[PDB]
Amino acid sequence: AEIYNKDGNKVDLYGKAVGLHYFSKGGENSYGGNGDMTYARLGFKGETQINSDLTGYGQWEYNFQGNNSEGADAQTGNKTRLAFAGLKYADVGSFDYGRNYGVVYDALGYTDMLPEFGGDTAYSDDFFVGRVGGVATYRNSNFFGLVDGLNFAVQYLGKNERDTARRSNGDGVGGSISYEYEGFGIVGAYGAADRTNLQEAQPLGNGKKAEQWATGLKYDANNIYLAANYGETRNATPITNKFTNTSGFANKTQDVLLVAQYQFDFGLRPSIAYTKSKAKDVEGIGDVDLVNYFEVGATYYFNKNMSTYVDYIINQIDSDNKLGVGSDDTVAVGIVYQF
Amino acid sequence: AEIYNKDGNKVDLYGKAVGLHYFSKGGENSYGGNGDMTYARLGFKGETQINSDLTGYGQWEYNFQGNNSEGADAQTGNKTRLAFAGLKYADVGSFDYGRNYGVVYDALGYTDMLPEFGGDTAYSDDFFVGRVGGVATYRNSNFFGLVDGLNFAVQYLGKNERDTARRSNGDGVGGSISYEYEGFGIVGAYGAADRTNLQEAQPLGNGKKAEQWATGLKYDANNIYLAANYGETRNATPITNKFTNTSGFANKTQDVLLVAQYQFDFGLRPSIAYTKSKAKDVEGIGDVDLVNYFEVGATYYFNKNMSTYVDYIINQIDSDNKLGVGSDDTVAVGIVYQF
Amino acid sequence: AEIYNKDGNKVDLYGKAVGLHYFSKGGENSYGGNGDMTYARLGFKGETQINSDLTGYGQWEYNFQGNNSEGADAQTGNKTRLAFAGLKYADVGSFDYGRNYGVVYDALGYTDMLPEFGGDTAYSDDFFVGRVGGVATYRNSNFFGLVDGLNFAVQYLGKNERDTARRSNGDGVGGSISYEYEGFGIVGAYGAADRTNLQEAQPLGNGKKAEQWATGLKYDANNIYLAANYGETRNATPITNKFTNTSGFANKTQDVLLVAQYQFDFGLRPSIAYTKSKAKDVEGIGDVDLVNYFEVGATYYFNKNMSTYVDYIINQIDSDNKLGVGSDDTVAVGIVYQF
Numbered sequence A, B, C: 001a002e003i004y005n006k007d008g009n010k011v012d013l014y015g016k017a018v019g020l021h022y023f024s025k026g027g028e029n030s031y032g033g034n035g036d037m038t039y040a041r042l043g044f045k046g047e048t049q050i051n052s053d054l055t056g057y058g059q060w061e062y063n064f065q066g067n068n069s070e071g072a073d074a075q076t077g078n079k080t081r082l083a084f085a086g087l088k089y090a091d092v093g094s095f096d097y098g099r100n101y102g103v104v105y106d107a108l109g110y111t112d113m114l115p116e117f118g119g120d121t122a123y124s125d126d127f128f129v130g131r132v133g134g135v136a137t138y139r140n141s142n143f144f145g146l147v148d149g150l151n152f153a154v155q156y157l158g159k160n161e162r163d164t165a166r167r168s169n170g171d172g173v174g175g176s177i178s179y180e181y182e183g184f185g186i187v188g189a190y191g192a193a194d195r196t197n198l199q200e201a202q203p204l205g206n207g208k209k210a211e212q213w214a215t216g217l218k219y220d221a222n223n224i225y226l227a228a229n230y231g232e233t234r235n236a237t238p239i240t241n242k243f244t245n246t247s248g249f250a251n252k253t254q255d256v257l258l259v260a261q262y263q264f265d266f267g268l269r270p271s272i273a274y275t276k277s278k279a280k281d282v283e284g285i286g287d288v289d290l291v292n293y294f295e296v297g298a299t300y301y302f303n304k305n306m307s308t309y310v311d312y313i314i315n316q317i318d319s320d321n322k323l324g325v326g327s328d329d330t331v332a333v334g335i336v337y338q339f
């Protein structure tokens, strides 16, 4: 909500309270788990008009879990999601630095549209596919003002030598290009980065370089939303072998995501989707599915501040998955107040 | 403070900064402890008018301790207190889900009125008596609009299998009924729930079911506040034996709380109170008091945003308490800015 | 930003998003380190007009790091910086209690003006020189209204027996006096406190009392900022021997800080500075420098909401420093949105 707008500065303080519960049998062997998943969000987005051509901006967003006790586990799953500041100049472009979405999410965003689940390959702290720390991102809209609908971006990812391989990365560069015309959109994005010493020390994955790319097609008009993503990764998708209790990265993955939605005027937005991510040449295993499901769901929008939803994942992962990926279904039910 | 109210949505951003210090001799053997207890609160409460009969709402509230260093202990005692969203329909009722007050607090709230202390049996993460995660709560005001002053509630508590017995619970159901008429109020509340495997594994407490109930009587008018609570619990009140360093739950407790306060027009609000909670059939011990004190205190309200207070607990727990419950007095002094 | 002002209460909700990166060779052997240092701040400052002479106030401020992953390390470096409430009466003075700046910072603030670095001796949780918990502070402006420009303060520091010696303190008292006249300012501040048993148990440092004092001179007018601080400490400055992996406090330090800055009308604010802190009579070592550098930097202010800066520390610590204090240079580059 815009709570301040004076002397060329405006501040949006936003957030949401999400009452959320997951239903799965037993849910350790399931897609999403079982039990209370309630959380809240808080953030600010500010923008200052420096002069007629130049705007400055900043954003911070935090996740507060609502499914922890007030005891020792109080902080589990709490984190800053975004924290960056930048400048945008006329049609020249924008530049921001901090914790922000990786540039391959410019493609993966096309299918990251489900009521609760979906967007499975947009891992956090995973090079260019999700939110990540220490990215400098340059974006250009409408090719310097010269070509309506043609956008591009480049992103410089600085090394993050963390205490876990899962959350680390080396230096890298990625980019994206998109074109939009009368409801349709097409996008491509690619990034490559060094892997850290700790990452190369892991049992699963082999190589000095992580690579991720994705393409997207969408139709987004007349209350209809259809989208598809195809992508591949090298030494970039995090995996765990639940049998050996061993972790690392998949040598290769092939990822497909499809989504179809409709927005009724009375507020209901049904969703159907399909997601499959398959790993290849995993040490000790070979080829193995990481994600494989159909989705059926719906959101009901009471208005722009209140909604409820149900999201059902019909899991197609089989019970003898060689990595021990959960095979059972999950249903989420949520009630959302947002501002 | 209401900081946004536009297009059928309003947002209250609220909080407080509480400078607070406890004085006890030595305070490990005392009621409240000794030293700095400063903290702050931040929260939002939003409400959207969906149509003339239906409102949506959401609330989140956090506790930031102000008595930690900026080093390793920075997060001690920090937590989300509340996080829920809901809908309220005409006189049909309200329904919310998330982290919220347990329904037996509908009774215990009557005496939870002291300047700093009091409300001793309203434990957090303790089935139905305090704030707890994963509760679906239905509330009805004035019996569907048909009976002025008659309210009721039912609450479904979902299992929380946590890493400690203290903070866990099984599935349960509780409810409350209250009636208010010309200053007087009467309330009753009861809940029962499964205990988790981890809870049943503890040395103290025996049984597959936790139960809590409480009754309340109050007079709240003409600047006078008088209230009484009586309740009992089974396998629900958390206890520790400081001698064996053993923990669990009391097989039975019998709880009484009394409070008397007056609000002077010039701002002073004196308080006197009495609290006793006695445990029964504790393994290895038998009968033992958990809480036993008289309180004298006062709050001075400068206005609705600024207050100060003093709260003195005259502890009646004896020095040879079989569980090692502290026997010394505590005085709290606080200065509160709130918005 | 002031987001509420009604019925004698006003609330400022403020914060910033700081995209920040440090460049050093290798940065473990450097002044500041290497890599992403992005963070955000959020706070409130409220003030209520109780009557014509009396105001109540409260403030809370938090640091959210933006350079952590969303995994296990999510909370590293997160903390409450400030949390206090108080009253201010006409010209009689102000009194606040909670987590606030130590009173010797009344002097050290003079030189704590650099774009990113500087203020090296204003350690957090270090008696009277930085932010600290459990301080009751009385401040007087213009000597009860009788002497324009003459201010003073006294501060009572309550014992904080923490789990680390570094973050602990005993009871203490400190104070400050300052005089300002036509651009010039002079200040002196001194505090002494008991050391806790845990502090006295450390290998480095010897004595039952910590002492800190500092003097300051400044000129702050006509777009010019010049300032100098001189101070000394006893058993108060925290130190680590990186060779023995041993920690404690310096028996004595002698500290000097100099700063010179200019604010151009077009927005640029160049900075030059010098800082030296030398420890004396360190057990096993003798005399040893803790800080020794020249600084050159600049901030560019686009307006009151957006800035960028560069801060270069030309480190003069030598490579064979007996405590293993880093000897390499560091450059910070930042982009700041604030509200």
Ligand SMILES: CCCCCCCCOCCOCCOCCOCCO
Binding pocket: A097, A134, A136, A156, A157, A158, A159, A171, A172, A173, A192, A193, A194, C019, C020, C021, C333, C334, C335
């Ligand atoms: C105003 C704040 C701006 C701070 C900028 C921080 C610089 C971020 O460093 C990014 C380093 O990335 C360089 C990429 O180097 C290429 C590495 O090779 C891997 C690609 O295949």
Ligand SMILES: CCCCCCCCOCCOCCOCCOCCO
Binding pocket: A224, A260, A261, A262, A270, A271, A272, A296, A297, A298, A310, A311, A312, A331
């Ligand atoms: C276990 C119960 C949870 C199941 C949720 C059911 C969701 C109800 O919505 C029905 C799905 O409707 C499919 C329509 O898909 C929209 C596709 O639109 C494309 C039209 O061009």
Ligand SMILES: CCCCCCCCOCCOCCOCCOCCO
Binding pocket: A019, A020, A021, A333, A334, A335, B097, B134, B136, B156, B157, B158, B159, B171, B172, B173, B192, B193, B194
């Ligand atoms: C819109 C979000 C709503 C999500 C609802 C979550 C469902 C919560 O589950 C509560 C389960 O409680 C059922 C009670 O079962 C009785 C157990 O027996 C113990 C009582 O003696």
Ligand SMILES: CCCCCCCCOCCOCCOCCOCCO
Binding pocket: B224, B260, B261, B262, B270, B271, B272, B296, B297, B298, B310, B311, B312, B331
């Ligand atoms: C160690 C010092 C701390 C003690 C705090 C003293 C509190 C001062 O207030 C006096 C208490 O006054 C008792 C009045 O109780 C109100 C009962 O009103 C019922 C009238 O119907």
Ligand SMILES: CCCCCCCCOCCOCCOCCOCCO
Binding pocket: B019, B020, B021, B333, B334, B335, C097, C134, C136, C156, C157, C158, C159, C171, C172, C173, C192, C193, C194
């Ligand atoms: C309205 C809240 C106010 C609460 C006040 C808390 C009291 C803080 O305690 C401070 C104790 O400091 C006393 C100083 O004693 C001197 C110790 O000797 C060391 C100095 O050389």
Ligand SMILES: CCCCCCCCOCCOCCOCCOCCO
Binding pocket: C224, C260, C261, C262, C270, C271, C272, C296, C297, C298, C310, C311, C312, C331
């Ligand atoms: C590695 C590159 C980083 C270096 C940053 C360069 C900073 C540019 O500013 C130039 C410094 O100018 C010095 C002026 O100092 C101001 C003193 O004013 C006193 C006048 O009375």
Ligand SMILES: [Mg+2]
Binding pocket: A112, A114, A115, A116, A117, A119
């Ligand atoms: Mg989503």
Ligand SMILES: [Mg+2]
Binding pocket: B112, B114, B115, B116, B117, B119
């Ligand atoms: Mg209370």
Ligand SMILES: [Mg+2]
Binding pocket: C112, C114, C115, C116, C117, C119
């Ligand atoms: Mg600074």
